């Protein structure tokens with residue numbers, strides 16, 4: 473279709489790293505781009521169908537807080553091409569650097585993430601893997617939600633109880649996206665990952681599933697707004713249908729951002 | 734279609750100003766947006782067809798240096814919705830402020846503009862009205878090429894001789910876009926508009942048409958690269974088909990930017 477980029481047009485550059493189901497490279501195509509070369513070689517009919525479905529979903533996204541899809545390749549192999557983002561992931565800023573954001577900045581990041589998610593859900597798109605390592609801070613300022621996944625057990629902390637239980641075939645929903653966002657809020661407000669005092673991964677899975685273990689909200693920073701702590705608890709509610717939806721989440725965080733400037 | 738935004742979803746805010754064929758407003762729709770309400774009321778079949786054509790062209794643009802189309806409205810009236818840009822136009826920075834960009838910055842702006850235009854031309858899209866007032870410096874850093882046109886005779890300085898002559902019905906081409914870009918380069922390197930020492934608009938039109946008047950390239954700044962001055966003269970060549978195309982223009986400006994960092 474019209475988003476297919478013919479072979480030879482993109483000059484592939486530096487190998488950035490192993491992403492989600494592919495290898496990401498910086499590239500040149502009318503400026504800078506990112507190019508994820510999918511791991512699949514000799515794809516089955518169902519792998520080609522799944523690729524076309526995902527391109528179809530990405531084609532429906534036009535929002536500043538969603539990583540900008542730019543095109544795809546078929547030959548010599550499957551690939552997704554997007555805008556190049558400058559900087560690092562939110563995971564890197566929060567958990568792999570000595571940079572400490574001020575509360576105004578943290579709330580701005582929460583607001584922009586909420587803008588992107590509110591947008592996705594309005595178009596009936598479920599992310600399914602929202603987490604800080606899938607949020608990029610383009611130019612250290614603009615949230616870009618995507619599927620970066622750079623260096624699974626590395627999504628366990630963001631999984632809602634119904635997802636982690638896996639008691640049904642498709643537990644992913646708007647509501648489980650909201651829970652994952654609640655964990656992102658926990659990361660922003662505490663600067664930390666949840667359950668850091670438990671060293672057994674299998675026991676985190678079991679306890680989050682049965683509702684005996686939840687994020688310790690007493691660890692939020694002293695200047696985290698009371699309303700943000702309340703909103704976070706709502707997003708993290710163990711019962712799927714007691715969680716808020718994104719229009720309200722966005723509206724409240726937008727007001728928190730407005731008060732800070 | 735799937736880019737139509739139902740009425741009631743967008744909260745229309747501040748009136749920004751009269752744009753090209755419409756009135757621009759800041760709005761709220763999953764975050765910030767811009768909304769141009771077209772002037773046309775009770776559109777004819779051909780005005781509705783022209784609107785659908787333009788949305789069709791905007792749908793083909795996914796590039797960081799092209800203003801991000803987000804959707805459109807039909808009722809109660811025709812409207813184009815895009816991302817909201819922070820800051821002001823390149824025209825404002827160069828000709829309506831005492832801010833003076835350094836040469837590194839000027840060349841960065843030229844590079845990003847070239848990225849956007851190279852992209853458009855690769856998809857066979859002719860802008861037809863490239864000028865500094867149609868280039869926005871989003872967050873004072875990122876070029877966004879669009880159709881802003883905020884407060885015609887206000888495109889005369891960017892018109893190639895064949896356009897200004899109007900000796901045929903459709904003188905707009907990739908090549909006339911390149912000429913307009915050459916005038917944008919003149920704006921960046923001199924900080925000025927061409928022909929400022931002539932106070933008669935009708936005489937500018939006649940002389941640019943017959944090739945007796947061209948931009949005074951001796952006014953470029955002392956630290957404007959010799960290669961940029963040469964490239965600019967090539968873009969401004971009076972004969973349509975002696976001008977370069979954007980792949981080469983982009984490559985050369987990219988190298989100028991690379992040397993400066």
Ligand SMILES: O=C(c1c(F)ccc(NS(=O)(=O)c2ccc(C(F)(F)F)cc2)c1F)c1c[nH]c2ncc(Cl)cc12
Nearest residue numbers: 496506507508539552554555556557599617618619620
């Ligand atoms: O890792 C990626 C990447 C990529 F190369 C291709 C595709 C994606 N994600 S994506 O498949 O297009 C995507 C998936 C889901 C969504 C959403 F948000 F659900 F809509 C948006 C985008 C990436 F995150 C990067 C894209 N731009 C970058 N800039 C810098 C770096 Cl270090 C990585 C990247």
Ligand SMILES: O=C(c1c(F)ccc(NS(=O)(=O)c2ccc(C(F)(F)F)cc2)c1F)c1c[nH]c2ncc(Cl)cc12
Nearest residue numbers: 757767768769800813815816817818860878879880881
């Ligand atoms: O003036 C506009 C505007 C708008 F409201 C609607 C549409 C457009 N342009 S556009 O029709 O979508 C458009 C037209 C042509 C192109 C291109 F580049 F040819 F592809 C891209 C975009 C605007 F420039 C602004 C868009 N975002 C803004 N942010 C701030 C301000 Cl002050 C104005 C605006």
